[PDB]
Amino acid sequence: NAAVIELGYMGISVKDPDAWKSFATDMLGLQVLDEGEKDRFYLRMDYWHHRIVVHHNGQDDLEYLGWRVAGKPEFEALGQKLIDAGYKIRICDKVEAQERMVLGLMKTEDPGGNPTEIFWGPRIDMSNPFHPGRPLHGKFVTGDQGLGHCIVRQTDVAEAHKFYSLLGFRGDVEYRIPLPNGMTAELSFMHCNARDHSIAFGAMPAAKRLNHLMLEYTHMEDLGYTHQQFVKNEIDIALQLGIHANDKALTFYGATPSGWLIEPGWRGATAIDEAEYYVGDIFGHGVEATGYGLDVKLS
Amino acid sequence: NAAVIELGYMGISVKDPDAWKSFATDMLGLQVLDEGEKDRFYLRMDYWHHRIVVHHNGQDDLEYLGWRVAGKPEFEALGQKLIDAGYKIRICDKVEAQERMVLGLMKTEDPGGNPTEIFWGPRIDMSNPFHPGRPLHGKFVTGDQGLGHCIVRQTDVAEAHKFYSLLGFRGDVEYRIPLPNGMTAELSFMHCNARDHSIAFGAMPAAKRLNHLMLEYTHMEDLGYTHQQFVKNEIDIALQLGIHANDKALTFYGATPSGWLIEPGWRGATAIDEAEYYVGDIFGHGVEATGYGLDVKLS
Amino acid sequence: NAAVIELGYMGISVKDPDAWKSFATDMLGLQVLDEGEKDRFYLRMDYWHHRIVVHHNGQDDLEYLGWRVAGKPEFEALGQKLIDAGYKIRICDKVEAQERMVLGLMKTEDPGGNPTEIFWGPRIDMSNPFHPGRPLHGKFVTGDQGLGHCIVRQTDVAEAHKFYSLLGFRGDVEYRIPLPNGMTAELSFMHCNARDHSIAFGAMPAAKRLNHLMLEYTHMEDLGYTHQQFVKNEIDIALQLGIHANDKALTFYGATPSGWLIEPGWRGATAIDEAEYYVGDIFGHGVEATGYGLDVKLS
Amino acid sequence: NAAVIELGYMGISVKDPDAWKSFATDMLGLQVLDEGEKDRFYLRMDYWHHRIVVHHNGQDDLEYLGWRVAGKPEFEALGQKLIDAGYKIRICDKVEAQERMVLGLMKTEDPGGNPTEIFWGPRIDMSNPFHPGRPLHGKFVTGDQGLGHCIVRQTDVAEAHKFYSLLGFRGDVEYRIPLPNGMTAELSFMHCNARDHSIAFGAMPAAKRLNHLMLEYTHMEDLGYTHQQFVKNEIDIALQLGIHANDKALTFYGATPSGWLIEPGWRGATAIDEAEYYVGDIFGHGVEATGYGLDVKLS
Amino acid sequence: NAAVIELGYMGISVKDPDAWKSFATDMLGLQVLDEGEKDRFYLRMDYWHHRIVVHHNGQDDLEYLGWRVAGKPEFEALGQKLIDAGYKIRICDKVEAQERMVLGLMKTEDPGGNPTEIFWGPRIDMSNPFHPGRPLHGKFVTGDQGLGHCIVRQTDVAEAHKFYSLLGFRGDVEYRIPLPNGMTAELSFMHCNARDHSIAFGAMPAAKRLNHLMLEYTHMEDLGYTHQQFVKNEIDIALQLGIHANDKALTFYGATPSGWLIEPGWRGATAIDEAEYYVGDIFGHGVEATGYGLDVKLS
Amino acid sequence: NAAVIELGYMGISVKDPDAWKSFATDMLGLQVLDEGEKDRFYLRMDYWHHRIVVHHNGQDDLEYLGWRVAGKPEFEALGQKLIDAGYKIRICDKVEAQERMVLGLMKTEDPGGNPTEIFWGPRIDMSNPFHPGRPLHGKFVTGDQGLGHCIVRQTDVAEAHKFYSLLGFRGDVEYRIPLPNGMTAELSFMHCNARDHSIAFGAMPAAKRLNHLMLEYTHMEDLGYTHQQFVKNEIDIALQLGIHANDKALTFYGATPSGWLIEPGWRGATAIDEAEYYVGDIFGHGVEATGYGLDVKLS
Ligand SMILES: [Fe+2]
Ligand SMILES: [Fe+2]
Ligand SMILES: [Fe+2]
Ligand SMILES: [Fe+2]
Ligand SMILES: [Fe+2]
Ligand SMILES: [Fe+2]
Ligand SMILES: [Mg+2]
Ligand SMILES: [Mg+2]
Ligand SMILES: [Mg+2]
Ligand SMILES: [Mg+2]
Ligand SMILES: [Mg+2]
Ligand SMILES: [Mg+2]
Q1: SS3 state at F285
Q2: How far apart, in whole angstroms, are the C-alpha atoms of residue D70 and residue C47?
Q3: Is C175 assigned to a binding site?
Q4: Could you give the CA distance from residue D214 to residue D261 in angstroms, rounded to a whole number?
Q5: Contact B278, B246 (CB under 8 A)
Q6: Which end is more exposed in chain B, N or C (fewer Cβ atoms within 10 Å of the end residue's Cβ)?
Q7: DSSP code of F226?
């Protein structure tokens, strides 16, 4: 049946666009595309016109997540499914769709208050191959796996699960992390394609909608050089290099100019439909800088 | 639809835990994990926290079989299917689920009286790779094929088949073995994944719930060394090395300290949905020690 | 340069041809070919007219080993190499070559007194496919690996090595086996193609030229059924099922009607040019019947 | 022609054997084998009886490197080659060969004074599979690539190159590293098989024969866990995680109890015969702890 | 060293060119190329300008075989080899080379009197793809295997073998065929590339230089349709469909308008350097029409 | 033996460096590297520090071709080979080698007067991945095939062939092109690795040393976009898109700012050692702009 198939794009808003352009290009290798618009620019990772929209005059947080469906029949079926289950949606007119550069667009909000968009028909600029903002050994892993994954704030995990399950995602609690206070932190991870997960969440308080965004390189050499760029430029590393037990990627977590975290990574594992859980990482991800919502002992 | 996907774990109870630890490690290569609990320890075969729970103060028999489903949606669908067909089940609370180290758990009994558990979300310790209790050339075959297979006692084969069929298993009578008394022994074999079978049974009387447990090595060299360990230690071999016509594995059957049989093996064939039957083994499995419920001529 | 490329054929002489025909067909699956000759018959394993010649009125021992070279240029080069190094050879005339069914033939004796023949151009009966003397799951491993391997008697290992090295073989001591008397038994193993070895020897006394002949099945099921045939017919098994550390095949050693041993096997490893040695088997090969020159503890 | 084919074994001497046993097992995953000898024990990495001999009462440095040749013909040819070129060698008697557990042994010293042994016929314990001293996800990369690589002290690079070239190695200067004093450090790297290099050296002063030993894991997860073990145990890391431009492995450099460095690594590239050079690493290998002969800026 | 690498071209002379054009196109699928020359036309099988030259006003027999060498260095080395061994050759001038459309050409005669040419640098018309003279399912097997194979007349097999061996061919007697008169017919087969053989011969009397030419289709369907064309047109079939024991191709032998035989075939086996012989075909090749030099019982 | 293995680098001199930087980046996608030197800059195509050196104040022509050998042993052997055959060479000192950024360098001139350099040990900047001067779908084909190929001026083809043959190249006349005046233009093509050819030449008069340089893209899309860039910018196209019969690449020929031609291409075929020749292209390469030394009808 009709389901979301990838995380297609995301919009963020920032207080310092100039800092973001330098950060995205030099530290990460993303491509900056400026179409001369007064209030925004774009970041590219592949042939798509863009994967991230960076709005100016902002709040240093997530503005929207854009989830792709295969085509108009799936768009319409999913819209009606959401309406029938009691969710509030709005089908956008052509001007709004053109703003996002998509053929069809609807807007809603997830149960945690995160603005959520569902669309079909992204604009692909095959004439304009990706050209990274610094030299790269490789490129990014996108394609059928979409742009990456995020953890976002939720207030009720069961409600969030219900919503994303309706959209076609699968998954549940995969981490039960012991905390010094004696409690346990539970995090749930959900997939909609071969990427281990595309969205994840728990019930931890959070000042921002977005906890982190993970972007995946094809080559280990690019991940390593990115890590070095963070160290040389003295950018906060919240979690050191390590490998989580679910996605099995080599990754670290570092500060963006907006204060939420980017997780550059390499060698993510294929999603599995069979639920299991873990109580720690395979190695690493030790805490270094704190204050980023990830002061947990993963070992 | 919703179905059992593997034999996930099993619990046994023993009169002599010390003998079992030495047996499991030296004779078989399993890993002993002791979490300091007064009444039990664990045996590992792979990344799962455990595959076998060994309870003390016991009856030298099977305590429960734990069957895995993919996730919560399948768990709930299967529970309702069992209720609708007239079977008695109990959904366990968090304390009971935590005892088994699973995210969701229900308890029932099969038609032969064997305690049967259905669960989702096993605990996987990716941080703690399998470390066998003796040096091994290889490891065990688990993964999508679960821990192994068992033959268990039944009083009514048709009723047992009905139950396991509802759980999603497939299979029927595969062996019709001539007996000297002129009768025929019929054994049925059922699969839920690529392992040739996970559960099997006939209508033969049996003092114990468990007839045998089969564990599969990846390497022939480990099977051979295990066989040698049984011979050198003068442990009863009930059936000598041979190959059954259905699962096509090289195996032998030897006594455990509890009196039921372990069947170490190598090179099991992929399960097939097309039913057929056989009247003898390919070779071997000659009777040596008797008194173990397998005094049959397989040739 | 010119070298021997395989063990092509062998001739044996027997006191009881009728017993040998039944043994070869029923116990091993070889094909008997009788061309109506008063004093001999043939055993086939593949498309070659034959691999073993069985002479009547015999001594229950090896008569000759026939080693193949690629063609006439290699035959002539090797002959001259042997002459130059001081060995005595005789190039056979057409009648003698026709007896062996080869295009070119020379006769000599190895340093241990074993009659040795070098030939080119075997007769292949492509019109007459192998038809085993009992039903087989598979066939034999021959082709570029020749018929099998043998251990034969030698009185001076260094001299034997010199001879076989000149013929193009490679290898050296691979087993140093501790003996109860405190000594060590050293055995050397030499290859001329991908079969782990084709000829092997040590300095142990021996009543016969031939210690054993190894024949390799393509299928484990045929090895197992052969083993069962020996057990059911109460034929002496000198060494039980096991795996040697060099050739890595699953094999056992059983009595032939002539008193020397046959070693049926399966899954032999590829020969390696890098010399190493071992002090025991991987598993098995325990002594059962004694008196066959292999009363050694291989573990 | 005759050439060295791998780094087969090495001998070291230590002041604190107990510390070394704990280090090798817990920090690296090597297997300790103690044969009850008063003055030494062994470390295993694979089926070889051992790869490293650890002598007691020592100097906390390298004692010998053992280089393998394929067999006796290569051993003898290489010996004569060394003699003809003016080097001093000694062919060892059986007692000395048995000490090293090899079939043939010769002793010499390289131009830098490093004791060098050439041997054929290592002892392989196929009956005794590797069993790591801590749980491992994988195993080590050995086989045709030998045990690993080392950098050792030399006083004259041209002379060292001449010697190793005669032994069959290939390679030359691959790194020209700028130094603050305005000079350049040149390091040469030589291979004898598919491992990027087995021996390397420059003309830098050094208090010890051995600068570092590199051991390669099959799995990234084991490298990462080893790195974590060094951090958690507060063991000096001389060079942080990084990738050199020649061997292309992910590696770090850490202190051993003897004061020279171990370089655990993963994913080494295949050796190439075409010489090239580099002036920096791909990423990482930043200096952390100093005093280990590697205070160079690799970037 | 320098060797012939393929049968590149052949020249024939015919009494009836019109009949030959119809035969080659309709019966075989060859392509006729007429360059407007008064005395000859060409037959193509692939991208080469031609593979067969058909001269008018002829003798209904072979005129020359053209054997290719890789380049000028091999041409010159082979010429000198022939001169040194006592053979008479002539290096052709540019006009003669241009006649054959080659870069270098020499002319000689084999020991049986067959005009033999050795050349390098054939003309390839990549602009002019093969276009068969009738519709074909597939194409011909040429490439590294050259145009096909022939049997030609010889008066002294040993002398012929000496000559072709000098040119770089390998092979010897492969068939010993019993004849009713009690004799044996011996035929020798020699290869210079992966085609089972390119030239073959025995000592049988023959009115023509050429006994047969074999051409190989890529598709069985084309062989079958060709066979049908011979039957429907009532063209003599000398040997019915069958498979020879050496080349293992499905083939039949049919009359050409010139009276010698064409052997269309499919699925020829790869040449082997190891000599063996056979005394019959695998099946078929029964005699039908006689008078073509192949009245032998192959079974 | 010792041979050249690739076209490693080339040096050109130009009158207009600014025009060349824009041309190389925008029209071709090469990377400009400027090290701040007053008289030159570099063009990159891969990890090598550079492949082309662009000298200022120049003659708008080739300055030198740099041919790579595997290492110092090959360098020294080739030098002595050249000296023994009567050619004049000079082994360069360290300053001259450092200028070219190589470990060893010698200078000579080919028989046509083209400055020729032979070197070992290029500088590879693995830390600095290729970053094209415009967005590219793919990258360039270099690696074991070197930078590309060139046609250069010669006055005596036989002499040129002798020289390049000594260096280890293979090949001969591959094109015989009919000319309206009734003559034939012969061009010879020589390879030293898998690239169809690396150097080619005939005896046509030429105002410049360099006729053309061919650079090969991995992706057809980049070739096509480059072609479009030439059309849109109204740059002379001397030969339109087409495919030559030898190298089988899709290519066109366009003017550089220096007046000699660049041949961007895609899908070149593997070099073959077997000489053949052609009299036309497969398609295309029609003449458009004239005056570039390629006014020939290739069809
Ligand atoms: Fe993440
Ligand atoms: Fe079983
Ligand atoms: Fe054997
Ligand atoms: Fe290293
Ligand atoms: Fe033929
Ligand atoms: Fe070109
Ligand atoms: Mg998941
Ligand atoms: Mg079944
Ligand atoms: Mg061997
Ligand atoms: Mg190297
Ligand atoms: Mg042949
Ligand atoms: Mg060429």
Answers
A1: coil
A2: 36
A3: no
A4: 9
A5: yes
A6: N
A7: H
Q: Using CA atoms, how far apart are residues C289 and C236, in angstroms rounded to an integer?
A: 6
| Torsion sign (Cα): E290, E292, E293, E296 | negative
C284 near C299, Cβ under 8 Å? no
- Distances in Å between the Cα of B126 and the Cα atoms of B49, D137, F134 are 9, 9, 45
Closest CB from E72, E121, E127 relative to F276: E121
Sign of CA pseudo-dihedral D270, D276, D282, D287: positive
- Cβ contact E108:E85 at 8 Å: no
Q: Under an 8 A CB cutoff, do A135 and F137 touch?
A: no
Residues of F in contact with E72 (CB under 8 A): 172, 275
Handedness of CA D238, D241, D244, D250 (dihedral sign): positive
The rounded Å distance from CA C197 to ligand 11 centre is 27
Q: How far apart are CA D49 and CA D123, in angstroms?
A: 6
**Phi and psi dihedrals of C221, rounded to 5?**
-60, -35
| Residue B27 phi, psi dihedral angles, 5° rounding | -85, -35
Kindly give the pairing relationship between strand D184-190 and strand D237-243: unpaired
Closest alpha carbon to A3 in A191, A141, A282, A231: A191
Residues forming a β-bridge with C33: C42
DSSP SS3 for E8: strand
What are the Cα distances from residue F146, in Å, to D246, D269, F141, F231? 19, 21, 8, 28
Q: Which residue in the set F70, F121, F123 is minimally distant from D279, CB to CB?
A: F123
- Domains present along chain D, CATH in parentheses: 1-135 (3.10.180.10), 136-299 (3.10.180.10)
Tell me, yes or no, whether chains C and A touch by having 3 or more C-beta pairs under 8 A: no
Q: Vertex C39, ends C34 and C40: CA angle to 5°?
A: 40
Q: What single letter denotes the amino acid at residue D21?
A: K
List A181's β-bridge partners, or say none.
none
Experimental method: X-ray
- Chains D and E in direct contact, meaning 3 or more beta-carbon pairs closer than 8 angstroms: no
Q: Is F136 on the interface with A (CB under 8 A)?
A: yes
- DSSP secondary structure string, B62-131? EEEEEEEESSHHHHHHHHHHHHHTT---EE--HHHHHHHTEEEEEEEE-TTS-EEEEEEEEBB-TTS---
* Cβ-based neighbours of E104, under 8 Å, separated by 6 or more: E72, E75, E97, E119, E120, E121
Query: Which one, of D112, D108, D75, D109, lies nearest residue D90 by Cα?
Result: D108
Please give the distance, rounded to the nearest whole angstrom, from the Cα atom of residue F263 to the centre of ligand 6: 6
Q: Which of A68, A64, A67, A108 is nearest to A88 (CA)?
A: A108
Q: What are the backbone dihedrals phi and psi of residue A269, each rounded to the nearest 5 degrees, phi first?
A: -85, 160
Give the helix, strand, coil percentages of chain E, each rounded to 5.
20, 35, 45
Q: What is the stated resolution of the deposited model, in angstroms?
A: 1.7
Residues 257-276 of D with CB under 8 A from F: 273-276
CA dist., res. E193 & res. E6, Å (int): 7
DSSP for chain D, please give it.
---EEEEEEEEEE-S-HHHHHHIIIIII-PEEE--S-TTEEEEESSSBS-SEEEESS--SEEEEEEEEESSHHHHHHHHHHHHHTT---EE--HHHHHHHTEEEEEEEE-TTS-EEEEEEEEBB-TTS----SS--SS-B--GGG-S-EEEE--S-HHHHHHHHHHTT-B--EEEEEE-TTS-EEEEEEEBSSSBS-SEEE-S---SSSEEEEEEEES-HHHHHHHHHHHHHTT--EEEEEEE-TTT--EEEEEE-TTSSEEEEEE-PPBP-SS--BBSS-SEE--B-S-SSS------
> Best interface-test mutation with E: which of C7, C124, C126, C144 has the largest number of E CBs within 10 A?
C126
